[PDB]
Structures are given as structure tokens and as C-alpha cells.
């Protein structure tokens, strides 16, 4: 019964078009609870879950301030990075950052994270020991020394191991009904005959939460999933998820094929026979 | 670290004055406080970056700028008697560093009067105790100087002027009863009639008895 | 946000323990400090705690109880030079405002053996 809290930040330069775009989103498992968007009206950190609303003036004032600090640091970084790589002022660039923490079944600290990317790939990441940095290139080395001198990992470690887990637990309790919930998938199959000699079986998992799930096609031991089509687990729109897998089984062997559903809301892994 | 000038300052209602402050730590966040006996420290103004400036708890009567990141001057345009207090300047790294610690500057003591007739330097007298009396404002730096070299060993002056101020220098009879050693009680006054900043001293020689 | 500090003057004999308490209101506070201010001087930093626990470096010991929103400072082996007024400060972020307590005065009286 593990959990995790994560924050995602996105920065995009707008060449010839003013200030860059800044989006910040916070999540507790698969459930988002806050957001900040530079294009939005309020210009403050906002709630996206019902349980975060009864937090108070001091919470929203502080979160707003802190989100503006991150936007400022990012806004400045876009210029810095273009400097390091000597890029033109003509092109648009992206910076993304993520950090959070995972707690075990007992809600005690497990893992801590802090990654940073530029133009879609890793630039610099804190190591699992929360005391070291991994640089992606010579330019990222500049940042690494700069951060070592600035004592940043020291600061993150304190946060990711403490505050982060302290607050997560706070949210877990406050969102007791929503977050600590677990929904088993409403599974079923479907068969689409292409012709007299070509059949398609589709395993269907629907209405499950969290999104963690693994679907496997197996013919009494046969590793068919190696040749199975699986779609990215998608959101239904009401807090639950959906996913499916399908294989082209030549008419006849279809009844020997069975699907395997894996989800935390199911005691024993379901095996559906056709 | 954080340096700030002047140390002391007397002004009369209406006079403008600017308290300079500087930091060489490459900090982006500097602030100004005033410390009064009944409230403790109170923020006046602060700045998180160059060109960004915001009012604090008691911004009334103060002006402030920040063209560079290294200095953050506090400007009073027309002095007021209520502005009499101790001013501490301080700085934090801001977005330039992960160390949360805020550092204070040495401090500047200011006093303001409405119809100036005051500012009387003190009158020092040695008795071993010393005594500076009748001075105003309470801006004094007092020390003991034996044979031309100040001592700190047995010196114990009062923490804050009672203005008047007392001080002790207790040595045993062997060093005092030596006719050739001279003690001097020096008092540095900060002032402006003619009561300019002065150095009023008193003395006594090691008696023979 | 506000910080409430110990009390008035705390007098302790030279060699004893001087223990100070501090309490804050903003639950989201992330950084905590202790300053020492000698009469007629500027506040000097002496302790910083970023995790809730016991930081005992030097002759000073600092405790942080986030759940109870409480901070401590225990001065072991008290010297009369310790006589100063101690200020508790707390903050949320790098752009947050530092907030101090009214300050608690400590006076370490020296051991006279005979008067």
C-alpha cells in the first residue's frame, strides 16, 4: 500500500512573444490536487481536489509565493541554458523539473526524487543517496559545481525525507475517502471476427484505480503478450482508468488463450477464459 | 559579510539621511529592520532582487532603492523624532543559494530632536571607576588605556548609558601602587554651538601609598 | 505567522543548563534558527535546524518538533559570557519573511565562593 507525492513543472520559451509559459502541477497518487498556470486568470496556486480546499489563507499564500519563486528561477534558466549551448534567440525551448517522495506501507519514507530536463532529455539529476548529482554533459557540469557550492542537495534531502512525507501523510488522511480508495477493474472480453480464419480477442480492464495494472495474454503458459497489442492506460475522466490488450488468434486456438489481469483491487490475479 | 555606515547619527526633525548597506556574498535578498525595546525587530522594507522593492511592517517615513544587488540604501527624506532607533541591515541568498541563513549587519544608532539645543558631549572623571556624564545622545565608545595601550582584561563598563555612564577597572595594589604607570579613561563622543564629535578623557597616576 | 518565546529573564549559575523554548504558528515553516544578541550588538546566528530532530553541534543542543511546532536550545556547561538575549526565527521559503520571537534573556551568574 505504497503512496507518493510529485510535482511537475514545465517551462517553454516564446521567441518574439514575451514571457515564457510556466505550468506547475501537483499529484498524490494518480490524483492531481493543485495547479499553477501562467496563462490563467487568478495568477495564484489553485486547488484541483476537494480535500485540498479546506487548507486556509496561510497555505495558499505560501504556495503561491513559492510557485512564483520557481517560475522566476525557471524563467532565468531558459536564458542561461541558451547561453551554455549558444543557441539562437529564434527557437523555442523547453525545461521541465520533477521532485517528490515515496512512502512504504507504513507511510515511512522510502525514496526521494529530483530530476531536471532540457529539450526533452535529462540535464542533471540528484542521486538516490540525496547527496550527489549526475550531470548529462559538459554544460550540465557547470550547474553541478554551482549547485554543490550552493549546498542544494543538502536542502532537498531535508525536504524529500521529511516535509514531503509529513505533508503527504497529511493529504492521505484528508483525502482518506478519495486517495486510500482502491477500485478493482470491471474486466470482460470481446471478439472481432475479421474473417473465417482470422480472429481478434480483446481483454478489457475498466473503472480501476489506481492506474497501476499489468495485462498479460497467455495460452496456458504461452508468452503471447510478446505479440499482443496494448494501449497506454487511459483516463476515463471521473478519477478512474481504462486499458486493453488484443492478439490475432487464428480461429480455433482462441479458446485455449486466457487473459491475466493484475491490479491491487483484486485478491487473486484474474484469468478470463474464452 | 554585511557592512553598514554610519555607526551613529544625530539629526533634527527635517534633515534627510541615508543609511548605506552592502553585502559581498552575492545575495539577492536584502532587508532593513529597526529594533525598539518594546517591539523587538520590525521589518521596514525589503528586496528580493535588483529593481524589486517592497514595504515591510513599518515602511512609513522610509524610502529605499536597489539598482545593484550589492547595496540596499535606506533613505529618510525628512527626519522625525519617532525614527529614533537602531537600524540593522540583513541579507539572505534568495534564488542564488540553498543556504536559508540570514545575516545581520553591524548596526547604526540614530537619534532625532525637534528644536535642537541638545547634543552635549560628556564630562569624564576617574575615581577604579570612571564616569562620563551629561552627554546626549547616548552615542559613546568608552575604554581604559594603561601606559598607552588599552586593556580589556579587568574592564567592565555598563551595557547601555543610564545620559551618564559608569565603568570599572579593578587591579590589585601591586600595579596601582607603582608611581610610574598611568591610567586613562577614554570616551569617544559622536555629535554635531560646538559639540563636535570628540574624545573626552580622564586620568590618574599610580599613587605611592 | 507568529513566534512565541519562553519568558522574561532566565537566571542560571555558571556551570548549569540554560534551556530555551520556542513555538510558531505557520505549519508550513521549513527553516528554523537561533540567534544570540549581546547588549548593544547585532543578532548573531548560532543555530539552524532543517529537519525535525536533535542537532547537538557544539555546546548547544537544538531540538525541533514539527508536529508540536516547537523549537529548543539547551546551553550545556554555562559560561557567564553566555549572558545575551536569544532570538528564535522561522521561515517557509527563500522568499519568505524571517520571523523572530520577542527574545528571551539569559543571565549566567558566576560562582563566588564566599562573601
Amino acid at each position: 500500500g505504497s503512496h507518493s507525492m510529485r510535482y511537475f513543472f514545465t517551462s517553454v520559451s516564446r521567441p518574439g512573444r514575451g514571457e515564457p509559459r510556466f505550468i506547475a502541477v501537483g499529484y498524490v497518487d494518480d490524483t492531481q490536487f493543485v495547479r499553477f498556470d501562467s496563462d490563467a486568470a487568478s495568477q495564484r496556486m489553485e486547488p484541483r481536489a476537494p480535500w485540498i480546499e479546506q487548507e486556509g489563507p496561510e497555505y495558499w499564500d505560501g504556495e503561491t509565493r513559492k510557485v512564483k519563486a520557481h517560475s522566476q528561477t525557471h524563467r532565468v534558466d531558459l536564458g542561461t541554458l541558451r547561453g551554455y549551448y549558444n543557441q539562437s534567440e529564434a527557437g523555442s525551448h523547453t525545461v521541465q523539473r520533477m521532485y517528490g517522495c515515496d512512502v512504504g506501507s507504513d507511510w515511512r519514507f522510502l525514496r526521494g526524487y529530483h530530476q531536471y530536463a532540457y529539450d526533452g532529455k535529462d540535464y542533471i539529476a540528484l542521486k538516490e543517496d540525496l547527496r550527489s548529482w549526475t550531470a548529462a554533459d559538459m554544460a550540465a557540469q557547470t550547474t553541478k559545481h554551482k549547485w554543490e557550492a550552493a549546498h542544494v542537495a543538502e536542502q532537498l534531502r531535508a525536504y524529500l525525507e521529511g516535509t514531503c512525507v509529513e505533508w503527504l501523510r497529511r493529504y492521505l488522511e484528508n483525502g482518506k475517502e478519495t486517495l486510500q480508495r482502491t477500485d478493482a477493474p470491471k474486466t470482460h472480453m470481446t471478439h472481432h471476427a475479421v474473417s473465417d480464419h482470422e480472429a481478434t480477442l480483446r481483454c478489457w480492464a475498466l473503472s480501476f484505480y489506481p492506474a497501476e495494472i499489468t495485462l498479460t495474454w497467455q495460452r496456458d503458459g504461452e508468452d503471447q503478450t510478446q505479440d499482443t497489442e496494448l494501449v497506454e492506460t487511459r483516463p476515463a475522466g471521473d478519477g478512474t482508468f481504462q486499458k486493453w490488450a488484443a492478439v490475432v488468434v487464428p480461429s480455433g486456438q482462441e479458446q485455449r488463450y486466457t487473459c491475466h489481469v493484475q491490479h491491487e483491487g483484486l485478491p487473486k490475479p484474474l484469468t478470463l477464459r474464452w | 559579510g554585511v557592512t553598514q555606515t554610519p555607526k551613529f547619527q544625530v539629526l533634527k526633525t527635517g534633515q534627510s539621511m541615508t543609511l548605506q548597506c552592502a553585502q559581498d556574498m552575492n545575495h539577492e535578498y536584502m532587508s532593513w529592520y529597526r529594533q525598539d525595546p518594546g517591539m523587538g525587530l520590525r521589518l521596514i522594507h525589503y528586496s528580493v532582487g535588483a529593481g524589486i522593492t517592497d514595504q515591510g511592517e513599518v515602511p512609513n517615513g522610509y524610502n529605499v532603492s536597489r539598482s545593484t544587488t550589492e547595496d540596499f540604501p535606506l533613505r529618510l527624506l525628512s527626519a522625525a523624532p519617532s525614527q529614533t532607533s537602531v537600524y540593522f541591515c540583513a541579507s539572505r541568498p534568495g534564488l542564488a543559494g540553498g543556504r536559508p541563513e540570514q545575516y545581520f549587519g553591524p548596526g547604526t544608532r540614530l537619534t532625532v530632536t525637534e528644536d535642537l539645543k541638545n547634543v552635549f558631549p560628556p564630562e569624564v572623571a576617574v575615581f577604579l571607576v570612571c564616569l562620563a556624564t551629561g552627554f546626549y545622545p547616548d552615542h559613546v565608545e568608552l575604554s581604559w588605556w594603561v601606559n598607552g595601550k588599552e586593556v580589556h582584561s579587568g574592564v567592565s563598563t555598563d551595557p547601555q548609558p543610564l545620559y551618564a555612564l559608569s565603568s570599572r577597572l579593578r587591579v590589585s595594589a601591586t600595579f596601582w601602587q607603582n608611581p610610574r604607570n598611568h591610567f586613562r579613561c577614554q570616551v569617544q563622543f559622536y555629535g554635531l554651538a560646538k559639540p563636535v564629535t570628540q574624545i573626552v578623557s580622564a586620568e590618574a597616576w599610580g599613587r605611592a601609598d | 505567522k507568529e513566534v512565541e518565546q519562553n519568558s522574561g529573564p532566565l537566571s542560571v549559575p555558571e556551570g548549569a543548563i540554560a534551556s530555551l523554548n520556542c513555538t510558531y504558528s505557520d505549519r508550513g515553516s521549513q527553516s528554523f534558527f537561533w540567534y544570540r544578541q549581546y547588549s548593544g550588538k547585532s543578532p548573531e546566528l548560532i543555530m539552524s535546524i532543517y529537519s525535525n530532530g536533535d542537532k547537538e553541534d557544539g555546546r548547544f543542543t537544538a531540538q525541533l518538533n514539527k508536529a508540536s511546532q516547537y523549537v529548543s536550545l539547551l546551553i550545556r556547561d554555562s559560561q557567564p559570557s553566555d549572558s545575551a538575549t536569544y532570538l528564535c526565527a522561522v521561515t517557509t521559503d527563500s522568499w519568505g519573511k524571517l520571523q523572530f520571537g520577542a527574545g528571551t534573556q539569559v543571565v549566567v551568574t558566576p560562582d563566588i565562593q564566599n562573601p
Binding site: 528561477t73 534558466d77 536542502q155 | - | -
Partner: peptide
């Protein structure tokens, strides 16, 4: 709750 000490790259 957000982290309180971001630093430029």
C-alpha cells in the same frame, strides 16, 4: 507542499 529553496542552473 512545495519545496522552498530552488536555485538557478
Amino acid at each position: 507542499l512545495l519545496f522552498g529553496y530552488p536555485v538557478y542552473v
